[PDB]
Design a protein around this motif. Structure first.
Motif, PDB file in Angstrom:
ATOM      1  N   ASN B 355       2.435   5.736  -7.302  1.00 19.17           N
ATOM      2  CA  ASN B 355       3.641   5.214  -6.664  1.00 19.17           C
ATOM      3  C   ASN B 355       3.794   5.794  -5.247  1.00 19.17           C
ATOM      4  O   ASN B 355       3.685   6.997  -5.034  1.00 19.17           O
ATOM      5  CB  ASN B 355       4.857   5.516  -7.541  1.00 19.17           C
ATOM      6  N   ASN B 359       5.213   0.747  -3.045  1.00 18.03           N
ATOM      7  CA  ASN B 359       5.755   0.414  -4.356  1.00 18.03           C
ATOM      8  C   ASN B 359       7.189   0.923  -4.574  1.00 18.03           C
ATOM      9  O   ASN B 359       7.971   0.250  -5.231  1.00 18.03           O
ATOM     10  CB  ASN B 359       4.763   0.986  -5.379  1.00 18.03           C
ATOM     11  N   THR B 466      -2.504  -5.395  -2.143  1.00 18.77           N
ATOM     12  CA  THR B 466      -2.133  -4.004  -2.037  1.00 18.77           C
ATOM     13  C   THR B 466      -2.767  -3.361  -0.811  1.00 18.77           C
ATOM     14  O   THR B 466      -2.158  -2.545  -0.131  1.00 18.77           O
ATOM     15  CB  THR B 466      -2.602  -3.276  -3.274  1.00 18.77           C
ATOM     16  N   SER B 518       6.755  -8.858  -2.891  1.00 20.41           N
ATOM     17  CA  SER B 518       7.856  -7.900  -3.030  1.00 20.41           C
ATOM     18  C   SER B 518       8.649  -7.644  -1.748  1.00 20.41           C
ATOM     19  O   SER B 518       8.183  -7.864  -0.627  1.00 20.41           O
ATOM     20  CB  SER B 518       7.322  -6.565  -3.553  1.00 20.41           C
TER      21      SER B 518
END
Ligand SMILES: [Zn+2]
Ligand SMILES: [Zn+2]
Lengths: 94, 665, 294, 318
Positions: B355, B359, B466, B518
């Motif tokens: 994390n 994130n 990512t 996101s």
DNA sequence: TTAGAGAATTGGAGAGTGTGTTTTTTTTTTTTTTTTT
DNA sequence: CACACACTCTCCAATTCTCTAA
């Protein structure tokens, strides 16, 4: 036998008489903007008309939801495109 | 099978009692044959977990407490036995068992990952073994206050004492061992929860996420305790000397450490930009203003008082709404009439890594104590002023060779480390004037610009988000650096010339896809785009043509979707958005591109008393923008009544009508 | 054009109700009451010329107190407002909710339009109330019947006892088990209008939202059992008694054994046959919901 | 193979005020300084109390509310007073960090492994006292002091404070399961191989129990304004505060006013609902009503109503 | 690059299964202890 | 017994995802 099919927005409802033609008739009369009001009241005067008309066409759904549904239907349906271009073609013709 | 499991537990428990004990004469005594028991336990880890991918030995060595009751006491006593001797200035035997205790610490503390290639038994134990690793971190940081971290640096000093040239590879291995031990003790992090979804949800959701063992608090594992135990055990002074002595074998573990304890610190807490009581007071006045708005929406009499409103509407027909608040406020009545609808449109919503800023929540902040905050900032300031420049120069060479071997974890811990340090050091040189910017001058060098840009390009082309997200973050920071050094003053021109055709098209495509991912992804795309447009504007290929590459409906969509999250955004990010809407409205006269209904609802929902705070700097320019927007909307509607449907739907592409719609002849 | 607001079942306009009551709540000289009953020889300049509710409200502001008593006969004394007295008797729950808010609008107008120097949030944060009294002829508790449901009534009696105070929930407070987000949820007719999903679109989890009882907000309810006064009884039998719910600032107005006069809306509610089902008894429990006690 | 959803704790929202209370309380506990005993002097009295606790291994800290009241314009004392039940987890999480700093020997119950220590923060010396008749739901979740006389005291019983369970379907373990007013098993198994949502057993070794006692108190027989009926209140005592009172005694309690749900209606494991109107429309109620008692949860207790050896007595006196 | 046809996953209708519900509770006799008879 | 509520199971179609040609 079946389950009842879901009621859902489509041009056969959205193009129908209380519908986009009702907007084109009533909205220019019922929606009023002025710098004499704060922006938040002007936004509310716009949104009232569309909220009550969306409730009349499709009481199932909330207002933001109805907007997401209208976006997907206007993107996909060729008859709805044909109706919209027809409105603009009238204003260009004049 | 289960007999094999219980025999394994019995064999490892009998080895665990064979290591030693408190002696009771308390001063821990080595068992006779301790070295052979340590070597046998290393053999057990290898010859089961490598050979069969089980995790069962690594699980059951926690059951019998081998780490917290044997390995830790053995290392901490040996540290005292060497510290005393150094202050006086079979110890050749005790070296071997100290080394093998560090070897087992590194094996037990090694990061856990789950993958498609993961065993059916590893995925079974994963969520459990993360709890034992949390107990290991607490015990390593608190057992005699990090004296084991002091023992680890001692085993590194044993090889730092012999020369950069005259060293052997079997000692450079020990350096890598000690660096891997610190990165592990840092990057023990509480686990993900996980649920089986073959069976649907009951009438309550997941009633606790709390992945912690029975005697660990969330604070025993936090960077506060890490920074405390590192400063008390002189770890920072070791890392600082080490990262300066680089004049290849270890550069990548050293970068890994700097990533693993810079990752979740948003830098702005390190700069403040009775004080805690004043800070508490201001926040209580904001919560008071919010509760005042809730009280203005609440019943002046009891829940059962029962008053009932009927709303007459056009077509001369009725609706009905309950509650005394609705009788007087038409806007509340219509809001309540929508709130009660029992339909919801189904929403649509979205890997082995830690994390990090990729994130973690936009609002997340880690609460340093005041001594910890100064011990951290002084460590990283010494690291930037000493070793960042040479460390980046070294790893950017090692990874410009060897790109294709970088599995996604290396690629992130390079890109994020580059971005975080350059952002921190830009911000230090903003407030402090004795900070040089040019101390991080390596970041703009052509070899590093090429690596960062290549890496983002390949991640975008291979659809590895990512890594594209981490690329977008680092590229946004390199752009901030370029703009700053241009304002301060030819390497600027070399990089600025180097993106003219293709990176332009890439960075224009990034926000067009952004609406599918996101909040942190959209945030990064918006910060990047703001920075790019501010750079290209300052330099003038053709500002009008390149911005017209951005003025397209898909970008406006991701901007509206970022702005829907505004209740959890900060004034900086809202000012970035409305600067872009001002740019579209005034500089382009594109205004039809923004007239869609989603924006009109979203302006009302944030301009409302229930929306943004009235005392916020953020509300002032939203109110100003709304006044201009409504003026141009009124003008457009008076001139072309069809815009009431055109505002309800997405725009057209049939040529003549599409032009007329967009511009009004 | 304007979507008119109407009291349900009535053909009464809430705008006309409000804009009349405002123009009574100021400009009412007490002179007009001494025209209504006459005694018109008695008119005294100092009291009777003063704007009665202006003086009452300026007192409320300076004392920092939220409740205005109102002798309903004043509504008949003032020409514009005679029909509002009849609306107050017939539609109490809505007409009182209009009056409550009109007080709060007036309290603000009395400082901001008057441009007087005082704290605005100190008024904006208050729940103001009217407490109407002297509403009509008193009646026997024994003379109540279903024609009177949802009307203001005026009763006299002896308090037998009070329950200890009962917390009645006014705002539910919910927390997401997954994401720690939280919501104030409005109670409506005694039903919690529970959310289906987390309000954070970055979370949106169904069923994971949960209630936290000690972070909810509450009103004060108290049951008084009230006996029929011995003057009113038919002499062939025992007095009757009626339960009454007293609310908010009126809780502990009364000691046991007080004689009192109460004004309240007469209510009826269905009650469950069995506590595990929604099956209801066909004859309803009745009580008065009080708005004034003397 | 599985179909499964991972579910990550880092994305939880933070209470920014709760954390600003934690920091202001943490700074207060170390720095507060002021002393007048013997001479004008600095003592850091709450650090001095933590170092006292380090000797005896006591699991409570007493705090004088007038010390909070004078600290930093009293905004911290205002917040702790008005919203105590929101801020208490942050007060305990703040105290833990200060105890970790000055006496890390206390940070566990302090061989086998010895557990996390639970700290009873005991506020005292409030500016104002309320009667049982002054209680109003408007003050729920806020720190009061209450004066009354005890009519009864219950047994000292164990609350299940933090529960721990094992799954009978897969033999996994769930831990730190916080308990509301009802007993509460986990809704989901932590093993992604397991489809379980029920069938849990308690581990009585790993789960942790508070001590608990109900004491029933009433308005004082000299205070009752007209000799009417005495109004009563249920007070809950925990940890060290149990048995600190006795029946017929006169006591001052300080703690939060709380609402207690009528737990039978809330669907309690293995019990029937019982049979005034509540509130409804909640997943756990279905068609039922939930109704509420007022109770008090006291953190500190003081009464206002033979050790025959000189070796103890001459050390007991100053 | 738009737009339209074909493939996969999720929502919820609705069918199916299983559980709890009546309900009371003073009255009248017999005894054993305090005290006020 | 039987009739509501609580709760799980299963199927079907509605929506969105992904690929192809206009
Ligand atoms: Zn949530
Ligand atoms: Zn299981």
């Amino acid at each position: 036998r079946k389950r009842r099919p879901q009621v859902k927005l489509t041009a056969e409802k959205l193009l129908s008489d209380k519908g986009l033609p009702y907007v084109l008739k009533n909205a220019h009369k019922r929606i009023r903007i002025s710098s004499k009001k704060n922006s938040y009241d002007n936004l509310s005067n716009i949104i009232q008309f569309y909220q009550l008309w969306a409730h009349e066409l499709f009481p199932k759904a909330k207002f933001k939801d109805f907007m997401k549904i209208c976006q997907t239907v206007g993107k996909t349906d060729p008859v709805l495109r044909e109706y919209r271009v027809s409105l603009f073609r009238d204003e260009m013709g004049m | 099978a289960d007999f094999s499991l219980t025999v394994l537990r019995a064999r490892i428990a009998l080895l665990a009692t064979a290591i030693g004990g408190p002696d009771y004469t308390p001063p821990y005594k080595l068992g006779d044959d301790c070295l052979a028991c340590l070597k046998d336990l290393k053999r057990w880890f290898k010859l089961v977990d490598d050979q069969q991918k089980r995790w069962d030995v690594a699980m059951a060595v926690a059951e019998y407490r081998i780490l917290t009751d044997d390995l830790l006491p053995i290392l901490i006593d040996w540290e005292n036995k060497c510290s005393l001797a150094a202050k006086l200035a079979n110890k050749a035997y005790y070296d071997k068992i100290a080394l093998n205790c560090l070897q087992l610490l590194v094996l037990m503390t090694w990061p856990l990952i789950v993958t498609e290639q993961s065993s059916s038994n590893q995925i079974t134990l994963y969520g459990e073994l993360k709890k034992h690793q949390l107990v290991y971190k607490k015990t390593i940081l608190s057992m005699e206050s990090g004296k084991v971290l002091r023992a680890a640096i001692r085993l590194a000093l044993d090889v730092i004492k012999i020369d950069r040239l005259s060293r052997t590879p079997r000692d450079n291995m020990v350096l890598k061992l000690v660096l891997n031990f610190f990165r592990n003790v840092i990057a023990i992090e509480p686990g993900e929860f996980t649920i089986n979804t073959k069976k649907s949800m009951p009438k309550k959701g997941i009633t606790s996420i709390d992945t912690l063992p029975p005697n660990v608090s969330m604070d025993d594992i936090s960077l506060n305790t890490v920074i405390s135990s590192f400063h008390k055990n002189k770890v920072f002074g070791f890392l600082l000397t080490l990262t300066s002595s680089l004049s290849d074998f270890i550069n990548i573990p050293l970068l890994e450490i700097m990533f693993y304890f810079t990752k979740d610190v948003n830098q702005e807490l390190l700069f403040p930009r009775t004080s805690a009581g004043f800070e508490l007071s201001k926040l209580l006045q904001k919560e008071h203003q919010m509760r005042k708005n809730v009280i203005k929406h609440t019943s002046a009499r009891h829940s059962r008082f029962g008053g009932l409103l009927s709303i007459q509407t056009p077509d001369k027909t009725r609706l009905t709404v309950s509650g005394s608040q609705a009788l007087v406020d038409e806007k509340i009545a219509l809001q309540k009439l929508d709130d009660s609808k029992k339909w919801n449109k189904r929403i649509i919503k979205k890997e082995g890594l830690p994390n990090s800023l990729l994130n973690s929540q936009t609002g997340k902040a880690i609460f340093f104590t005041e001594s910890n905050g100064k011990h951290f900032k002084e460590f990283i300031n010494n690291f930037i002023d000493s070793g960042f420049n040479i460390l980046l120069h070294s790893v950017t060479n090692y990874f410009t060779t060897e790109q294709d071997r970088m599995v996604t974890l290396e690629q992130v811990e390079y890109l994020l480390f580059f971005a975080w340090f350059v952002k921190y050091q830009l911000l230090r040189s903003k407030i402090d004037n004795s900070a040089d910017i040019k101390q991080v001058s390596e970041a703009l060098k052509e070899v590093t610009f090429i690596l960062v840009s290549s890496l983002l390009r390949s991640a975008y082309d291979l659809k590895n988000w990512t890594v594209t997200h981490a690329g977008m973050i680092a590229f946004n920071e390199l752009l901030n650096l370029v703009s700053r050094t241009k304002a301060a003053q030819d390497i600027e021109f070399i990089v600025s010339r180097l993106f003219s055709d293709e990176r332009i098209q890439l960075l224009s495509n990034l926000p067009k896809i952004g609406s599918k991912y996101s909040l942190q992804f959209m945030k990064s795309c918006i910060e990047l785009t703001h920075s790019v447009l501010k750079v290209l504007e300052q330099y003038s290929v053709n500002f009008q043509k390149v911005q017209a590459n951005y003025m397209t409906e898909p970008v406006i969509e991701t901007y509206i979707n970022f702005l829907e999250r505004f209740r959890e955004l900060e004034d900086d990010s809202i000012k970035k958005v409305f600067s872009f809407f001002h740019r579209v409205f005034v500089q382009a006269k594109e205004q039809a591109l923004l007239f869609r209904f989603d924006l009109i609802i979203l302006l009302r929902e944030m301009l409302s008393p229930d929306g943004l705070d009235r005392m916020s700097r953020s509300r002032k320019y939203v109110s100003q923008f709304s006044d201009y927007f409504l003026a141009r909307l009124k003008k457009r509607l008076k001139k072309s009544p069809a815009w009431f449907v055109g505002l309800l739907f997405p725009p057209l592409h049939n040529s003549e009508v599409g032009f007329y719609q967009r511009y009004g002849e | 054009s304007e979507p008119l607001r109407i009291i349900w079942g009535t053909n009464v306009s809430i705008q006309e109700c409000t804009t009349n009551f405002r123009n009574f709540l100021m400009s009412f000289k007490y002179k007009f009451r001494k025209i209504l009953d006459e005694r018109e020889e008695f008119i005294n300049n100092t009291t009777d010329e003063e704007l009665y509710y202006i003086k009452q409200l300026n007192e409320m502001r300076e004392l920092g107190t939220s409740n205005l008593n109102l002798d309903a006969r004043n509504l008949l004394a003032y020409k514009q407002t005679e029909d509002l007295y009849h609306q107050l008797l017939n539609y109490p729950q809505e007409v009182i909710s209009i009056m409550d808010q009109t007080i709060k609008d007036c309290m603000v107008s009395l400082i901001v339009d008057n441009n007087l120097d005082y704290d605005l949030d100190e008024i904006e944060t208050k729940f103001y109330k009217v407490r109407p009294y002297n509403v009509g002829s008193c009646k026997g508790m024994r003379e109540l019947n279903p024609n009177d449901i949802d009307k203001l009534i005026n009763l006299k009696g002896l308090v037998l006892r009070s329950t200890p105070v009962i917390p009645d929930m006014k705002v539910a407070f919910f927390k997401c088990n997954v994401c720690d987000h939280t919501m104030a949820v409005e109670i409506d007719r005694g039903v919690i209008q529970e959310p289906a999903r987390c309000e954070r679109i970055d979370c949106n989890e169904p069923n994971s939202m949960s209630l936290i009882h000690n972070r909810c907000s509450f009103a004060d309810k108290q049951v008084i059992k009230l006996q029929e006064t011995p003057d009113f009884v038919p002499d062939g039998q025992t007095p009757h008694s009626i339960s009454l719910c007293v609310y908010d600032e009126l809780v502990d107005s009364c000691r046991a054994g007080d004689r009192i006069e109460v004004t309240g809306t007469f209510r009826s509610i269905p009650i469950r046959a069995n506590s595990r089902q929604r099956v209801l008894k066909s004859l309803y429990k009745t009580y008065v919901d009080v708005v004034h006690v003397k | 193979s599985f179909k499964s959803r991972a579910l990550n704790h880092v994305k939880k929202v933070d209470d920014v005020t709760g954390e600003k209370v934690r920091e202001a309380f943490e700074q207060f506990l170390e720095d507060f300084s002021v002393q007048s005993t013997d001479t004008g002097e600095v003592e850091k009295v709450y650090r001095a109390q933590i170092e006292f606790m380090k000797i005896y291994d006591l699991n409570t800290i007493y705090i004088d509310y007038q010390h909070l009241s004078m600290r930093e314009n009293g905004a911290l004392a205002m917040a702790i007073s008005e919203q105590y039940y929101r801020f208490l987890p942050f007060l305990q999480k703040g105290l833990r960090r200060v105890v970790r700093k000055y006496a890390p020997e206390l940070l566990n119950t302090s061989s086998p492994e010895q557990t996390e220590r639970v700290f009873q923060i005991s506020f005292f010396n409030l500016p104002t006292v309320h009667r049982i008749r002054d209680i109003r739901s408007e003050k729920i979740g806020s720190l009061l002091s209450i004066s009354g006389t005890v009519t009864r005291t219950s047994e000292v019983r164990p609350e299940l404070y933090k529960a721990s369970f094992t799954c009978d379907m897969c033999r996994a373990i769930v831990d730190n399961v916080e308990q509301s007013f009802k007993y509460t098993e986990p809704t989901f198994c932590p093993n992604p191989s397991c489809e379980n949502r029920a069938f849990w057993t308690l581990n009585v070794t790993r789960s942790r129990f508070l001590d608990w006692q109900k004491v029933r108190i009433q308005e004082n027989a000299n205070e009752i304004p007209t000799g009417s009926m005495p109004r009563t209140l249920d007070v809950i005592l925990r940890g060290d505060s149990v048995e600190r009172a006795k029946p017929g005694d006169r006591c001052k309690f300080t703690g939060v006013e709380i609402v207690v749900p009528d737990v039978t209606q809330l669907g309690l494991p293995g019990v029937k609902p019982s049979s005034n109107s509540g509130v409804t429309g909640l997943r756990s109620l279905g068609v039922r009503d939930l109704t509420y008692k007022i109770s008090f949860l006291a953190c500190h207790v003081i009464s206002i109503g033979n050790e025959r050896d000189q070796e103890v007595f001459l050390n007991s006196l100053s």
